Design a protein around this motif. Sequence first.
Motif, PDB file in Angstrom:
ATOM      1  N   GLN A  60      13.343  47.699  61.952  1.00  0.00           N
ATOM      2  CA  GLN A  60      12.898  48.077  60.624  1.00  0.00           C
ATOM      3  C   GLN A  60      11.570  47.401  60.316  1.00  0.00           C
ATOM      4  O   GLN A  60      11.268  46.341  60.878  1.00  0.00           O
ATOM      5  N   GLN A  62       9.345  45.172  57.862  1.00  0.00           N
ATOM      6  CA  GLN A  62       9.473  44.205  56.783  1.00  0.00           C
ATOM      7  C   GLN A  62       8.981  44.802  55.470  1.00  0.00           C
ATOM      8  O   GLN A  62       7.966  45.501  55.433  1.00  0.00           O
ATOM      9  N   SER A  63       9.703  44.499  54.388  1.00  0.00           N
ATOM     10  CA  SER A  63       9.418  44.994  53.037  1.00  0.00           C
ATOM     11  C   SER A  63       9.404  46.519  52.999  1.00  0.00           C
ATOM     12  O   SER A  63       8.439  47.146  52.557  1.00  0.00           O
ATOM     13  N   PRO A  65      12.961  48.537  52.428  1.00  0.00           N
ATOM     14  CA  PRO A  65      14.416  48.636  52.535  1.00  0.00           C
ATOM     15  C   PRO A  65      14.910  50.068  52.422  1.00  0.00           C
ATOM     16  O   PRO A  65      14.239  50.955  51.891  1.00  0.00           O
ATOM     17  N   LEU A  66      16.111  50.277  52.951  1.00  0.00           N
ATOM     18  CA  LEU A  66      16.784  51.566  52.943  1.00  0.00           C
ATOM     19  C   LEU A  66      17.991  51.484  52.029  1.00  0.00           C
ATOM     20  O   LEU A  66      18.898  50.688  52.280  1.00  0.00           O
ATOM     21  N   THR A  67      18.026  52.321  50.997  1.00  0.00           N
ATOM     22  CA  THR A  67      19.213  52.385  50.164  1.00  0.00           C
ATOM     23  C   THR A  67      20.369  52.972  50.964  1.00  0.00           C
ATOM     24  O   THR A  67      20.188  53.490  52.069  1.00  0.00           O
ATOM     25  N   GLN A  71      20.948  54.637  54.765  1.00  0.00           N
ATOM     26  CA  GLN A  71      21.684  53.812  55.713  1.00  0.00           C
ATOM     27  C   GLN A  71      22.798  54.602  56.388  1.00  0.00           C
ATOM     28  O   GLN A  71      22.908  54.607  57.619  1.00  0.00           O
TER      29      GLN A  71
ATOM     30  N   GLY B   5      19.707  45.927  52.234  1.00  0.00           N
ATOM     31  CA  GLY B   5      18.725  46.904  52.651  1.00  0.00           C
ATOM     32  C   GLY B   5      18.467  46.957  54.131  1.00  0.00           C
ATOM     33  O   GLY B   5      17.724  47.829  54.584  1.00  0.00           O
ATOM     34  N   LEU B   6      19.053  46.053  54.900  1.00  0.00           N
ATOM     35  CA  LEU B   6      18.904  46.038  56.345  1.00  0.00           C
ATOM     36  C   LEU B   6      20.042  46.862  56.917  1.00  0.00           C
ATOM     37  O   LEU B   6      21.154  46.825  56.388  1.00  0.00           O
ATOM     38  N   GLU B  21      26.320  33.895  52.399  1.00  0.00           N
ATOM     39  CA  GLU B  21      25.937  34.328  53.737  1.00  0.00           C
ATOM     40  C   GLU B  21      24.739  33.492  54.162  1.00  0.00           C
ATOM     41  O   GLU B  21      23.624  33.692  53.680  1.00  0.00           O
ATOM     42  N   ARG B  27      12.554  28.524  63.492  1.00  0.00           N
ATOM     43  CA  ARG B  27      11.333  28.613  62.710  1.00  0.00           C
ATOM     44  C   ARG B  27      10.556  29.852  63.119  1.00  0.00           C
ATOM     45  O   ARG B  27      10.383  30.119  64.311  1.00  0.00           O
ATOM     46  N   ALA B  33      11.878  37.110  55.527  1.00  0.00           N
ATOM     47  CA  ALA B  33      11.808  38.562  55.461  1.00  0.00           C
ATOM     48  C   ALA B  33      13.142  39.156  55.047  1.00  0.00           C
ATOM     49  O   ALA B  33      13.186  40.102  54.250  1.00  0.00           O
ATOM     50  N   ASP B  37      13.660  41.192  51.598  1.00  0.00           N
ATOM     51  CA  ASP B  37      14.206  42.543  51.654  1.00  0.00           C
ATOM     52  C   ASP B  37      15.420  42.685  50.754  1.00  0.00           C
ATOM     53  O   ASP B  37      15.565  43.695  50.054  1.00  0.00           O
ATOM     54  N   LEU B  40      14.125  42.784  47.093  1.00  0.00           N
ATOM     55  CA  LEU B  40      13.467  44.039  46.762  1.00  0.00           C
ATOM     56  C   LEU B  40      14.429  45.213  46.739  1.00  0.00           C
ATOM     57  O   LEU B  40      14.167  46.189  46.036  1.00  0.00           O
ATOM     58  N   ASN B  41      15.542  45.147  47.474  1.00  0.00           N
ATOM     59  CA  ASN B  41      16.518  46.231  47.410  1.00  0.00           C
ATOM     60  C   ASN B  41      17.228  46.322  46.064  1.00  0.00           C
ATOM     61  O   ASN B  41      17.853  47.349  45.783  1.00  0.00           O
ATOM     62  N   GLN B  56       8.262  24.328  50.878  1.00  0.00           N
ATOM     63  CA  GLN B  56       7.537  25.283  51.694  1.00  0.00           C
ATOM     64  C   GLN B  56       6.049  25.168  51.417  1.00  0.00           C
ATOM     65  O   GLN B  56       5.628  24.611  50.403  1.00  0.00           O
ATOM     66  N   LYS B  57       5.262  25.708  52.338  1.00  0.00           N
ATOM     67  CA  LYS B  57       3.825  25.795  52.148  1.00  0.00           C
ATOM     68  C   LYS B  57       3.505  26.635  50.922  1.00  0.00           C
ATOM     69  O   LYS B  57       4.214  27.593  50.604  1.00  0.00           O
ATOM     70  N   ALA B  58       2.429  26.270  50.225  1.00  0.00           N
ATOM     71  CA  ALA B  58       2.102  26.960  48.984  1.00  0.00           C
ATOM     72  C   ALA B  58       1.573  28.364  49.249  1.00  0.00           C
ATOM     73  O   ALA B  58       1.744  29.264  48.422  1.00  0.00           O
ATOM     74  N   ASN B  67       3.921  39.582  46.648  1.00  0.00           N
ATOM     75  CA  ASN B  67       4.781  40.693  47.062  1.00  0.00           C
ATOM     76  C   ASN B  67       5.770  41.067  45.965  1.00  0.00           C
ATOM     77  O   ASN B  67       6.007  42.249  45.696  1.00  0.00           O
ATOM     78  N   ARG B  71       5.533  44.792  44.354  1.00  0.00           N
ATOM     79  CA  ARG B  71       6.615  45.726  44.649  1.00  0.00           C
ATOM     80  C   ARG B  71       7.492  46.022  43.444  1.00  0.00           C
ATOM     81  O   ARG B  71       8.623  46.479  43.632  1.00  0.00           O
TER      82      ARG B  71
ATOM     83  N   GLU H  62      -1.114  20.462  52.744  1.00  0.00           N
ATOM     84  CA  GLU H  62      -1.225  21.411  51.651  1.00  0.00           C
ATOM     85  C   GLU H  62      -2.379  21.104  50.709  1.00  0.00           C
ATOM     86  O   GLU H  62      -2.407  21.622  49.589  1.00  0.00           O
ATOM     87  N   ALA H  95       5.727  23.217  61.040  1.00  0.00           N
ATOM     88  CA  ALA H  95       6.154  23.743  59.751  1.00  0.00           C
ATOM     89  C   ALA H  95       4.971  24.069  58.847  1.00  0.00           C
ATOM     90  O   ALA H  95       5.145  24.755  57.835  1.00  0.00           O
ATOM     91  N   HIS H  96       3.779  23.591  59.190  1.00  0.00           N
ATOM     92  CA  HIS H  96       2.561  23.908  58.464  1.00  0.00           C
ATOM     93  C   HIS H  96       1.537  24.646  59.309  1.00  0.00           C
ATOM     94  O   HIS H  96       0.651  25.292  58.749  1.00  0.00           O
TER      95      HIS H  96
END
Lengths: 72, 73, 72, 359, 131, 271, 122, 247, 120
Positions: A60, A62-63, A65-67, A71, B5-6, B21, B27, B33, B37, B40-41, B56-58, B67, B71, H62, H95-96
């Motif tokens: 798939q 990335q970004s 999705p499938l409803t 699916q 959505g996967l 889950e 890494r 992702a 996902d 966004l679903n 996390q990194k900024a 995103n 979206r 950072e 990690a960076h």
Amino acid sequence: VSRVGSAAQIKAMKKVAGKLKLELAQFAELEAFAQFASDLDKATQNQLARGQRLRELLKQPQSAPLTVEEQV
Amino acid sequence: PLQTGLIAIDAMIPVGRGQRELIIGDRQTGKTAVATDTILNQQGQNVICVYVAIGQKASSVAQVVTNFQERGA
Amino acid sequence: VSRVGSAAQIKAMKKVAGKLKLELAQFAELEAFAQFASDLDKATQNQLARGQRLRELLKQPQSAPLTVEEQV
Amino acid sequence: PLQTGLIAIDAMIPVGRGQRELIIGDRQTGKTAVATDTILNQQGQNVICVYVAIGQKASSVAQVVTNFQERGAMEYTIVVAETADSPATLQYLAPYTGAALAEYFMYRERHTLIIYDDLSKQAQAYRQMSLLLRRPPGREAYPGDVFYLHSRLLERAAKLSSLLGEGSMTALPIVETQAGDVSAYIPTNVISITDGQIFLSADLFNAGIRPAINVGISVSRVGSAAQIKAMKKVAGKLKLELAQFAELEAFAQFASDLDKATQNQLARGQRLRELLKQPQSAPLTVEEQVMTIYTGTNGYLDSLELDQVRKYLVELRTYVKTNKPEFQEIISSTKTFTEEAEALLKEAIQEQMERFLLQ
Amino acid sequence: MTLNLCVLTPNRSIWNSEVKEIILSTNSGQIGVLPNHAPTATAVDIGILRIRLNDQWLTLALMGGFARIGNNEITILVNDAERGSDIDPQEAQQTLEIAEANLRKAEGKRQKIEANLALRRARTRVEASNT
Amino acid sequence: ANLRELRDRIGSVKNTQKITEAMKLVAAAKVRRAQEAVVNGRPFSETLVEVLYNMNEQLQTEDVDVPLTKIRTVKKVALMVVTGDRGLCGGFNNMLLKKAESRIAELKKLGVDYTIISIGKKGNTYFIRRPEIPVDRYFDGTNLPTAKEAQAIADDVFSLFVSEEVDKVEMLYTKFVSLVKSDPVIHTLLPLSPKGEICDINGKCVDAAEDELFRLTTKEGKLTVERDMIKTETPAFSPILEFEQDPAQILDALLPLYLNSQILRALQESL
Amino acid sequence: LQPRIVGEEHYEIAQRVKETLQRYKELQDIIAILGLDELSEEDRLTVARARKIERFLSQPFFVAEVFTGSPGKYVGLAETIRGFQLILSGELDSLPEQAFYLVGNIDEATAKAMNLEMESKL
Amino acid sequence: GLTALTMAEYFRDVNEQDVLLFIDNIFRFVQAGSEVSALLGRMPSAVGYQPTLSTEMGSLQERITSTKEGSITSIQAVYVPADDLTDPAPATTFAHLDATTVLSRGLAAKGIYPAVDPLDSTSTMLQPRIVGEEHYEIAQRVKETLQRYKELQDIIAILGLDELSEEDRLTVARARKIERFLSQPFFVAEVFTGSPGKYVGLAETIRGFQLILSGELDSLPEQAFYLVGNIDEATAKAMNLEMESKL
Amino acid sequence: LQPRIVGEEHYEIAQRVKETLQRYKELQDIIAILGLDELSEEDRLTVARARKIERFLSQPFFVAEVFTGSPGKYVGLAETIRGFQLILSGELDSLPEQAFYLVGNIDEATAKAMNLEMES
Ligand SMILES: Nc1ncnc2c1ncn2[C@@H]1O[C@H](COP(=O)(O)OP(=O)(O)OP(=O)(O)O)[C@@H](O)[C@H]1O
Ligand SMILES: Nc1ncnc2c1ncn2[C@@H]1O[C@H](COP(=O)(O)OP(=O)(O)OP(=O)(O)O)[C@@H](O)[C@H]1O
């Protein structure tokens, strides 16, 4: 693993995804030692075209999705 | 159900509404992702998502915020 | 390991069990190597057989004591 | 170049005047061996050598002092020493006294050398001095200063500017390993401070190769600057052929089954390795080193045998030292491997092999 | 003019260049070959070969063949071909004595077919190795 | 001692890895040599079977009755199981012994009373330790497979058959049809047709799938065998060969040659 | 163990013994999984000679008669260097590899070899 | 490291330059952090690094970003303790990090500079929807060609040579072309080794490797792409070497 | 597990099952590096028997049926012993190894072998 997976998975996805699970598990098994023993069988050629292609339809972008309709 | 959505997740390892889950993985293996996902679903369903990002990194969280705004999320 | 050795046995078992543990160590170490082989000599293979017989006579069942007369 | 008296050192992993280069490797493997080979080789030069015998047995120290004296190289060598029976204080101190002596002689516009033996005993002494003073312990009980302790004394061996008289201290310390571990605290510290490393693996020491220098790990970062013009060419040819030998090491007993090219490759590499062996405390000068490496890497031993080639090469070295003294003239006056020098060497080679095949 | 020679064995091809004259035995008699002969098949048996091409005669120890001569070339297909010099004549005389001894130890159809075979084998090794 | 023994186990699994690559490369070198050695015996057997066909046309009318191609009363079938003298190859030895035990089980119910020939050390040792099978002769790999081993097995089956002691002699050897599957085919050798075309154990004349001259190539990073069917062919015939030497004796001269070439190609293809 | 401290033939024979043993211990993790029919004659000869040498360096001590079952032994340096010259140079590769087990002199190894072979032939 | 960082971020903040930062290397910074913290009497972390490993890494990394003023980019070497990426110093450095450029001793021994390893260089930027689908497919096909050749080095370049396949000869030839074309005559290798420098822009790299792949530059010598800049310079070098071929 | 509690037969069968399982466990390294062809026939007899046992040691659960889909099976001790005796005798070694996987009684495994040779 999902403990409560098949409870929350709807009836439609259940009925359509049982056979997907069976074929994907058998493909993960048949890919191991695929060359020597089971090379030119009818079942293994068919299952390679149905176990590479199953994995082809799992992947798939990335970004995107499938409803549930797309699916099933 | 809570559909991510996967195809694979929502197919053979489903996620309930009320079920943890763990997205365990190395890494740079795609866990962010998967989480984006899932978020966004939920564009229609009354799932008020919250995404907490520890340490996390900024630039990563800024790109994810971009995103999430673009979206419609 | 036995640090007292055959000064802790009677003369009978001291006679017949003279070079027993050492020859059994030798038989075990050469049976481990005779699996890295295909064809051997009949003399050494008979030696492997006799070492196997010495190995088989020492399995003692639980709650089954042997006396020193039986042992020797 | 700081000429070492060993083919492997001066040919492959080159040490110059100023570069720090330690000898890592397991116990009783050749560290003191090459550490005395270097110093005993310096008699042809004029340098001032320093030995810092830390925490030793006080009997090996008397033995190696008797070596340096009965070999004549004590005419310039200072050997500071503080054995194990000393407190941790003096063991910690002694390398700094050696470094101050070498610093002084280096600041008199004079090239120098210094040998540390070993930094592990010095670090153990400092770690004990710290833990007794309730300084907080760190990794494997070493305090948080052994890096600064070692870098402090290793940054003092410099090739100073040409306005300060280009003096040079060449710190060549020694750090032994336990069970073949250079990733411990003290070994990692010292191999990060020093410029190059020289790995002396005791496996090769039990495999006839003496000195047991392991080229696959040992590397210096100075490069061609520590090799003369007559050296770097055959050093390049030798590293080429020896990499092509080591990459073909697995195909050992299949050499008849091999290709004819790879068969010559394996056999020539074996001749090179048997040339690489040389006895303890037998120095080789730059004429001798370039003669050996030339006759080896250009296939002038491929008619010979893996046993004879040591006797054959020492006899060729004697023949070219006695009969053809002009090669030493050319090498020590011109510092290059010219066409006439190469042809003179080949004609010495040819007549020596013709006389020796009759024997 | 000069015919070609192919002393061809199963594994290798021994002589492949030309020749002007060869003399070789057969299963019933012998044959001589002059230049430009008719296409004539030849059942050559176990035996030595006489070859002549601007040199002296040389024995080629052959051990059972067939030659389908056509034009300009003779394809001497032998399962066992070798030159008379390379086989050591003392080895030939040892083989000769060994074969003459081990002929008499054969007393049956399975045995005699490995009695005259070995006897003519050592004999046709000798008939080369002497020459 | 845990970290040292763990480092040493790491080193052992490294040394075994690199020497397995070494045995892989020397084995591929000897494979590439063996497929050239097939071509080293190709023109011989090529023109040989072309002779066996073209000379047979005028002798199709008359009957020669060659003892190599005679029909004895079909009672017994001998079996040469062509194993390599090597181990660790893989299923090669074991699939040979599977087809071998299948053949000597299949021939027991017909009432055949078979025999066996063994020409591999890892096979003739198995037939040493199993006395139930009637073994006539053991062969090892000491003499040269180019001429000497081929000739030894050749004259041995010739002695078993031309004095007509055993009834049949047939061959159990595999081919180079693939890398992932070797198939031990069972071709009969000593009851042969005078044409130059081998018969099956039942006489099927199975050379329709000849497909000879295997040569290794690569379609990708891996190598497949690419069996690469027949390339060249140059027979015509002899118009009037007007030949001497008793055509019966000529065909009895031409048969053992072709037999030795068949055995040589069999040993090369097995190896 | 030096040329100028312990004599030339002793030093050469000692470094040679350590050489062939290092060769065997390097060979071990290959001949484990490879097998014994896939080494060359020089390599299998090295394996068998090292397997003799390792047993020959075992001597029944005087204080260990309780632990071994054998009268005590005392071996000279001359006898030991003779034994290793004889084992290495090739003239004893027909003796059993248990003949060098717990023997004092190479003469005792030969007499034990005769003992073993005579008992096996009966 | 913080000294160099603030000296660079001034250039970012007030002159809006595209600043280039170099921390060679980050392992000495992590080690010195551990040694400071070990002398401070702090209880150390897992392997022995300072208890504050991740926050010390973050407060150095950072600050190296891209703002609306300018953008400071850092290229910082790493030493990995006995090549153990499971150790905390590499696993926290990555990690960076975003990309890696693993220079090879193999492409130095072969003698083509820069000595990087294309099969071992990773980037998060190499995605289609970041740098284009064209650049993505070009890089993917180039990787696949080199991955063919690396396994084929043992196959044909050692033993096989059995007229490998024309579909495989076409890969071996253009893999030679691409291994030659990866090099570039540097600006500051001129006085060093004798190579006059050239800048090769990104689009020109993509078009050049496009035409090396696409079956248009297979006929020229494989050295016509070695130590050359753009692709037009490569075809011109082919014509000049062919003038020396007719000489 | 002592013969005074579970009797002689049960402890005997259990002992030999553990023996064969450890034999396969010892051979597992040699199997994992190279494979199975390098073994003797008497060694592959134990490898095959333990490969059948390692699958027959599974048993579907009355709870975990909602996961796998195979419904729960309760099997007795007196029939577990007879199943393992039929395995160790060799009256079942001909049918394949995935037949024994996820069953209850021994007749479920034999009927599984008979069943998976109907769907061609
Ligand atoms: N399904 C996908 N399709 C396309 N690209 C993907 C997919 N999954 C992940 N990626 C890409 O892989 C890269 C790393 O993925 P991601 O950021 O999700 O993993 P991560 O564990 O968060 O990495 P890090 O923790 O280092 O940020 C991202 O650039 C993302 O765009
Ligand atoms: N090139 C060589 N040829 C022959 N023998 C050598 C050589 N180098 C060293 N030796 C021998 O190795 C032994 C140990 O040498 P050395 O003392 O240099 O090891 P070391 O690592 O310094 O020992 P330690 O760890 O006790 O300081 C000495 O007996 C010496 O004679």
